[PDB]
Ligand binder design. Structure first.
Ligand code: 5OD
Length: 497
């Protein structure tokens, strides 16, 4: 569970060179291509490149299956759960992950950074255990590990906290700390000294507890940050650093893997976490609760014809009053969601549930439907559910401008507020992770902003990671990540005007 097999800055020829020179039959590595990826596997003394497409909904292993994360794909195939057979029939077997040495995707690596800058950052934002690695300014080629140790966090003036700088020599492509073991990369060195902290001569234990947070920003300055991330790419490096931490979120999904529930998932290997699974009071639905660390969400898949009734049971049980569909019924020739709502003015029964379609309202980017949900046998249980069906989301990538999405979310939020103590807001697309995660993260950040104003801190990676711990693969592509950033920027600018 390390994910050292993903090389962010490698190309096809370099991957072939690595697999043949420093590898053996069974060695594999994943690499990024424009939005797609490649799994290069050594077999029979040669290399085979399998394409992995991710347009925004899921990872598509050509000749394989759909996955919410590259980590889960590699796990699925290494552990023999599935066999990556080729069109010929011969099995392509993953065996030995060829570890990468590039640290640009590590949370704690800040190349362009001086000693005084790093010490100032640690004094300001770091606490006990906060650490970072930087390039040595006095020794070109070597590095420096700056670690803080003390009692409290912040720029204290009592001598209880302090910053220590440990030199890291890079000799013959191997990293050491002036003596002892020589590690194959900065990552191995950092992990070793995380497990086995250094002890100073007088007792001080240099604990590498958490990396120094460099992503939390004040909203007012997002503009600058965006430019700082636009000058490889800033957005790309930050999103890849976020992806690197996906192997720490492979939680249990046994309920979705049950044989009774197989037919209730649109995609086989995209399942809900057990600890945030939506339980029905026939208890299974591919849905998860998303709770920001007041308004909660339900992230779920597009309805299957055999799950519409369970979907409406969920909406009723959870007392949800707002639904957000971010996909049309068919995309690029494939079906992504079954029509689960009645035609305008019509009334339809889904199992024990009943749904009237009172009125519809066609907007530029979306359609609003005022449905009335009730339970057959008791009319007192009639309630109004407002379905906001977004229709102008491109089949590939993300919108070019976030204004439509922002007004959409603003209306959704006002509607959710109009109903007192309303249940979670249901949000779904196809697999319920890509567009769903993007919309939910944007809604969370914009709610923070609207409540606390411009004078507040926002952390996009932290929010996305908190949401990913509740459903696998929330926010799928770097395009959606940059779109989140740009939508926050646009909302800040509109509020400032
Ligand atoms: C310059 C650099 N090499 C790439 C950007 N940078 C960072 C920092 N922190 C995060 C972060 C923040 C909160 C949660 C999670 Cl999970 C993550 Cl990963 C991040 N994604 N990138 C630092 C190193």
């Amino acid at each position: 569970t390390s994910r050292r097999w993903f090389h962010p800055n490698i190309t096809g020829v370099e991957a072939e060179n690595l697999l043949l020179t420093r590898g053996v039959d069974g060695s594999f590595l994943a690499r990024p291509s424009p939005g797609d990826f490649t799994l290069s596997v050594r077999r029979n003394g040669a290399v085979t490149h399998i394409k992995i497409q991710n347009t925004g909904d899921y990872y598509d292993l050509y000749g394989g299956e759909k996955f919410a994360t590259l980590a889960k794909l590699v796990q699925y195939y290494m552990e023999h759960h599935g066999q990556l057979k080729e069109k010929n029939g011969d099995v392509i077997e993953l065996k030995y992950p060829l570890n990468c040495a590039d640290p640009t995707s590590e949370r704690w690596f800040h190349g362009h950074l001086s000693g005084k800058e790093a010490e100032k950052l640690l004094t300001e934002k770091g606490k006990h255990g906060s650490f970072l690695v930087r390039e040595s300014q006095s020794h070109p080629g070597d590095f420096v590990l700056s670690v803080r140790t003390g009692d409290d966090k912040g720029e204290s003036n009592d001598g209880k906290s302090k910053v220590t700088h440990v030199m890291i020599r890079c000799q013959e492509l191997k990293y050491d700390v002036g003596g002892g073991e020589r590690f194959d990369s900065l990552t191995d060195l950092v992990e070793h000294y995380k497990k086995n902290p250094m002890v100073e001569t007088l007792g001080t234990v240099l604990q590498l507890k958490q990396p120094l947070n460099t992503t939390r920003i004040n909203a007012a300055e997002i503009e600058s940050r965006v430019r700082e991330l636009s000058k490889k790419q800033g957005f790309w490096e930050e999103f890849e650093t976020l992806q690197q931490q996906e192997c720490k979120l492979l939680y249990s999904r046994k309920e979705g893997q049950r044989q009774e529930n197989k037919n209730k998932n649109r995609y086989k290997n995209i399942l809900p976490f057990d600890h945030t699974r939506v339980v029905l009071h026939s208890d299974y639905i591919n849905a998860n609760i998303i709770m920001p660390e007041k308004k909660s969400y339900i992230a779920t898949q597009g309805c299957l014809q055999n799950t519409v009734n369970d979907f409406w049971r969920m909406v009723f049980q959870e007392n949800s009053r707002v639904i957000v569909m971010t996909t049309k019924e068919v995309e690029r020739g494939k079906s992504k969601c079954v029509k689960y709502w009645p035609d305008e003015y019509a009334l339809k029964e889904y199992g024990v549930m009943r749904v009237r379609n009172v009125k519809e309202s066609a907007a530029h980017d979306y359609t609003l439907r005022e449905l009335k949900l009730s339970k057959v046998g008791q009319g007192n249980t009639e309630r109004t559910v407002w379905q906001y069906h977004f229709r102008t989301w491109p089949d590939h990538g993300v919108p070019s401008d976030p204004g439509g999405v922002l007004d959409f979310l603003e209306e959704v939020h006002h509607k959710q507020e109009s109903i007192m103590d309303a249940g979670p807001v249901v949000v779904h697309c196809s697999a319920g992770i890509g567009r769903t995660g993007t919309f939910i993260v944007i809604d969370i950040l914009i709610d923070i902003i609207r409540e606390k104003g411009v004078d507040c801190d926002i952390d996009v990676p932290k929010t996305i990671q908190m949401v990913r711990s509740q459903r696998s693969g929330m926010v799928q592509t770097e395009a959606q990540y940059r779109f989140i950033y740009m939508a926050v920027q646009h909302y800040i600018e509109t509020l400032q005007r």
